[PDB]
Design an enzyme around this catalytic site. Structure first.
Site, PDB file in Angstrom:
ATOM      1  N   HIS A   1      26.776  33.303  22.313  1.00 16.92           N
ATOM      2  CA  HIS A   1      25.850  32.852  23.369  1.00 16.92           C
ATOM      3  C   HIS A   1      26.620  32.318  24.566  1.00 16.92           C
ATOM      4  O   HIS A   1      26.133  32.360  25.696  1.00 16.92           O
ATOM      5  CB  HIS A   1      24.926  31.756  22.849  1.00 16.92           C
ATOM      6  CG  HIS A   1      24.332  32.036  21.502  1.00 16.92           C
ATOM      7  ND1 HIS A   1      23.163  32.745  21.340  1.00 16.92           N
ATOM      8  CD2 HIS A   1      24.723  31.665  20.260  1.00 16.92           C
ATOM      9  CE1 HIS A   1      22.866  32.814  20.055  1.00 16.92           C
ATOM     10  NE2 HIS A   1      23.800  32.169  19.377  1.00 16.92           N
TER      11      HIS A   1
ATOM     12  N   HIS B   1      31.861  24.253  27.396  1.00 13.31           N
ATOM     13  CA  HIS B   1      31.371  25.611  27.580  1.00 13.31           C
ATOM     14  C   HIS B   1      30.604  25.650  28.882  1.00 13.31           C
ATOM     15  O   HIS B   1      30.387  24.609  29.511  1.00 13.31           O
ATOM     16  CB  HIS B   1      30.464  26.031  26.441  1.00 13.31           C
ATOM     17  CG  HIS B   1      29.272  25.145  26.293  1.00 13.31           C
ATOM     18  ND1 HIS B   1      29.270  24.029  25.484  1.00 13.31           N
ATOM     19  CD2 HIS B   1      28.057  25.183  26.889  1.00 13.31           C
ATOM     20  CE1 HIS B   1      28.096  23.428  25.574  1.00 13.31           C
ATOM     21  NE2 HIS B   1      27.345  24.104  26.426  1.00 13.31           N
TER      22      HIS B   1
ATOM     23  N   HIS C   1      27.141  27.644  31.103  1.00 11.16           N
ATOM     24  CA  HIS C   1      25.957  28.492  31.166  1.00 11.16           C
ATOM     25  C   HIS C   1      25.978  29.133  32.540  1.00 11.16           C
ATOM     26  O   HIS C   1      26.318  28.472  33.511  1.00 11.16           O
ATOM     27  CB  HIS C   1      24.664  27.695  30.963  1.00 11.16           C
ATOM     28  CG  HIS C   1      24.644  26.890  29.701  1.00 11.16           C
ATOM     29  ND1 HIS C   1      23.969  27.295  28.569  1.00 11.16           N
ATOM     30  CD2 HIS C   1      25.236  25.712  29.389  1.00 11.16           C
ATOM     31  CE1 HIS C   1      24.143  26.399  27.612  1.00 11.16           C
ATOM     32  NE2 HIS C   1      24.908  25.428  28.083  1.00 11.16           N
TER      33      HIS C   1
ATOM     34  N   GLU D   1      21.433  25.018  34.077  1.00  8.19           N
ATOM     35  CA  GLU D   1      20.335  24.609  33.228  1.00  8.19           C
ATOM     36  C   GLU D   1      19.596  23.472  33.919  1.00  8.19           C
ATOM     37  O   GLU D   1      18.393  23.551  34.161  1.00  8.19           O
ATOM     38  CB  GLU D   1      20.866  24.206  31.853  1.00  8.19           C
ATOM     39  CG  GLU D   1      21.535  25.372  31.163  1.00  8.19           C
ATOM     40  CD  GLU D   1      21.559  25.213  29.667  1.00  8.19           C
ATOM     41  OE1 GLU D   1      22.121  24.205  29.188  1.00  8.19           O
ATOM     42  OE2 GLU D   1      20.972  26.077  28.985  1.00  8.19           O
TER      43      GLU D   1
ATOM     44  N   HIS E   1      29.380  22.163  30.563  1.00  6.88           N
ATOM     45  CA  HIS E   1      29.054  21.076  29.658  1.00  6.88           C
ATOM     46  C   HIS E   1      30.262  20.657  28.875  1.00  6.88           C
ATOM     47  O   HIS E   1      30.794  21.445  28.083  1.00  6.88           O
ATOM     48  CB  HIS E   1      27.937  21.489  28.702  1.00  6.88           C
ATOM     49  CG  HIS E   1      26.629  21.707  29.387  1.00  6.88           C
ATOM     50  ND1 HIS E   1      25.599  22.440  28.833  1.00  6.88           N
ATOM     51  CD2 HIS E   1      26.179  21.266  30.585  1.00  6.88           C
ATOM     52  CE1 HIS E   1      24.574  22.446  29.668  1.00  6.88           C
ATOM     53  NE2 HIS E   1      24.901  21.738  30.736  1.00  6.88           N
TER      54      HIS E   1
ATOM     55  N   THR F   1      20.743  21.845  24.598  1.00  5.50           N
ATOM     56  CA  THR F   1      19.928  22.836  25.300  1.00  5.50           C
ATOM     57  C   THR F   1      19.888  24.188  24.580  1.00  5.50           C
ATOM     58  O   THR F   1      19.255  25.139  25.055  1.00  5.50           O
ATOM     59  CB  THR F   1      20.431  23.053  26.735  1.00  5.50           C
ATOM     60  OG1 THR F   1      21.745  23.617  26.689  1.00  5.50           O
ATOM     61  CG2 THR F   1      20.439  21.714  27.513  1.00  5.50           C
TER      62      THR F   1
HETATM   63  C1  LIG Z   1      23.862  20.888  14.594  1.00  6.41           C
HETATM   64  C2  LIG Z   1      25.358  21.027  14.873  1.00  6.41           C
HETATM   65  O1  LIG Z   1      26.164  20.613  14.060  1.00  6.41           O
HETATM   66  O2  LIG Z   1      25.818  21.641  16.074  1.00  6.41           O
HETATM   67  C3  LIG Z   1      24.770  22.121  16.902  1.00  6.41           C
HETATM   68  C4  LIG Z   1      24.981  23.474  17.302  1.00  6.41           C
HETATM   69  O3  LIG Z   1      25.965  23.535  18.471  1.00  6.41           O
HETATM   70  C5  LIG Z   1      27.391  23.784  18.194  1.00  6.41           C
HETATM   71  S1  LIG Z   1      28.263  24.275  19.704  1.00  6.41           S
HETATM   72  O4  LIG Z   1      29.697  23.779  19.585  1.00  6.41           O
HETATM   73  O5  LIG Z   1      28.300  25.786  19.858  1.00  6.41           O
HETATM   74  N1  LIG Z   1      27.705  23.759  20.835  1.00  6.41           N
HETATM   75  C6  LIG Z   1      27.470  22.361  20.728  1.00  6.41           C
HETATM   76  C7  LIG Z   1      26.487  21.797  21.749  1.00  6.41           C
HETATM   77  C8  LIG Z   1      26.163  22.657  22.841  1.00  6.41           C
HETATM   78  O6  LIG Z   1      24.902  22.078  23.471  1.00  6.41           O
HETATM   79  S2  LIG Z   1      24.839  21.826  24.988  1.00  6.41           S
HETATM   80  N2  LIG Z   1      24.278  23.104  25.744  1.00  6.41           N
HETATM   81  O7  LIG Z   1      23.508  21.146  25.218  1.00  6.41           O
HETATM   82  O8  LIG Z   1      25.427  20.483  25.382  1.00  6.41           O
HETATM   83  C9  LIG Z   1      25.876  24.012  22.491  1.00  6.41           C
HETATM   84  C10 LIG Z   1      26.576  24.527  21.237  1.00  6.41           C
HETATM   85  C11 LIG Z   1      27.632  24.817  17.148  1.00  6.41           C
HETATM   86  O9  LIG Z   1      27.350  26.173  17.697  1.00  6.41           O
HETATM   87  C12 LIG Z   1      26.864  24.619  15.932  1.00  6.41           C
HETATM   88  O10 LIG Z   1      27.057  25.818  15.065  1.00  6.41           O
HETATM   89  C13 LIG Z   1      25.404  24.434  16.146  1.00  6.41           C
HETATM   90  O11 LIG Z   1      24.796  23.990  14.922  1.00  6.41           O
HETATM   91 ZN   LIG Z   2      25.537  23.720  27.156  1.00  7.30          ZN
END
Ligand SMILES: CC(=O)OC[C@H]1O[C@H](S(=O)(=O)N2CCC(OS(N)(=O)=O)CC2)[C@H](O)[C@H](O)[C@H]1O
Ligand SMILES: [Zn+2]
EC number: 4.2.1.1
Length: 257
Positions: free
Chosen positions: A61, A91, A93, A103, A116, A195
């Site tokens: 993603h 990362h 967006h 976003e 972010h 998000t």
């Molecule tokens: C529940 C948990 O343990 O992590 C939340 C989620 O997100 C992270 S992430 O490193 O890929 N990453 C963290 C937060 C990011 O969110 S952001 N867009 O709001 O600040 C997006 C994804 C990972 O992808 C995890 O596999 C996924 O479960």
């Molecule tokens: Zn993000």
């Protein structure tokens, strides 16, 4: 499962993740005229000099640049926060077009991309536990506008063809995230959520007033990434943003007049 396409995108997420219609969902529009200056808000403390980057990963993603978070190396404190938060990853967006991609919006205005920087509260011991808490994460959000290049971003741009498809990763040591920051640390803050699914309401959002400028070539290369895995039909990784969500009870505070 979930994605950013018409059949699995943000309008669909609530079926697997009911919290999508929750009371503190992100992103939101930042109405600058309604955000109130809080003279009691502290300056942000961004301590990144000991940051230890490790790896960059196409997770299908976006791409994540990951850090060593097993020790207090790169931390966020101060501002609205009352704890120590460790940097785990950053990362972006972004959009298919320069006029969309962020976003958060500012007075309904969309930037070309949004950075972010994700941090978790060290009182909860690890990231998995932190996301289950209302004050588990602090995410520093930085807008990107298209203009002059950001030199500190180029090492990221350079490596993207080595991680074109979902599940590819590459070594990404010795990257300095300080090179991604604007001059000012003036910010807006509000309580919100991840998000992306699982959309947990665990985030103190800190969104910087000043965008950084990136070149059209730099964001161009973001858009050559793929949502799909290798050997699958090519789907360009573009428009991986969630739109602004209802603000509901919440008030956005500004660190600045
Ligand atoms: C529940 C948990 O343990 O992590 C939340 C989620 O997100 C992270 S992430 O490193 O890929 N990453 C963290 C937060 C990011 O969110 S952001 N867009 O709001 O600040 C997006 C994804 C990972 O992808 C995890 O596999 C996924 O479960
Ligand atoms: Zn993000």
């Amino acid at each position: 499962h979930w994605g950013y396409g018409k059949h699995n995108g943000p309008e669909h997420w609530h079926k697997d993740f009911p919290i999508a219609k929750g009371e503190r969902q992100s992103p939101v529009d930042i109405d600058t005229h309604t955000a109130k200056y809080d003279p009691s808000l502290k300056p942000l403390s961004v301590s990144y000099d000991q940051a230890t980057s490790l790896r960059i990963l196409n997770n299908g993603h976006a791409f994540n640049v990951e850090f060593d978070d097993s020790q207090d190396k790169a931390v966020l404190k101060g501002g609205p926060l009352d704890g120590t938060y460790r940097l785990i990853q950053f990362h972006f967006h972004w959009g298919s077009l320069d006029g969309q991609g962020s976003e958060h919006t500012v007075d309904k205005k969309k930037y070309a991309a949004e950075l972010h920087l994700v941090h978790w509260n060290t009182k909860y011991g690890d990231f998995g536990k932190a996301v289950q808490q209302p004050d588990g994460l602090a995410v520093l959000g930085i807008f990107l506008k298209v203009g002059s290049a950001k030199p500190g971003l180029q090492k990221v741009v350079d490596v993207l063809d080595s991680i074109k498809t979902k599940g590819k990763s590459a070594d990404f040591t010795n990257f300095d995230p300080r090179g991604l920051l604007p001059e000012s640390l003036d910010y807006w803050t509000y309580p919100g959520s991840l998000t992306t699914p699982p959309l947990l309401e665990c985030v103190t959002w800190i969104v910087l007033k000043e965008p950084i400028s990136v070149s059209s070539e730099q964001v161009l290369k973001f858009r050559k990434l793929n949502f799909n895995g290798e050997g699958e039909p090519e789907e360009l990784m573009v428009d991986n943003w969630r739109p602004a969500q209802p603000l509901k009870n919440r008030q956005i505070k500004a660190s600045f007049k």
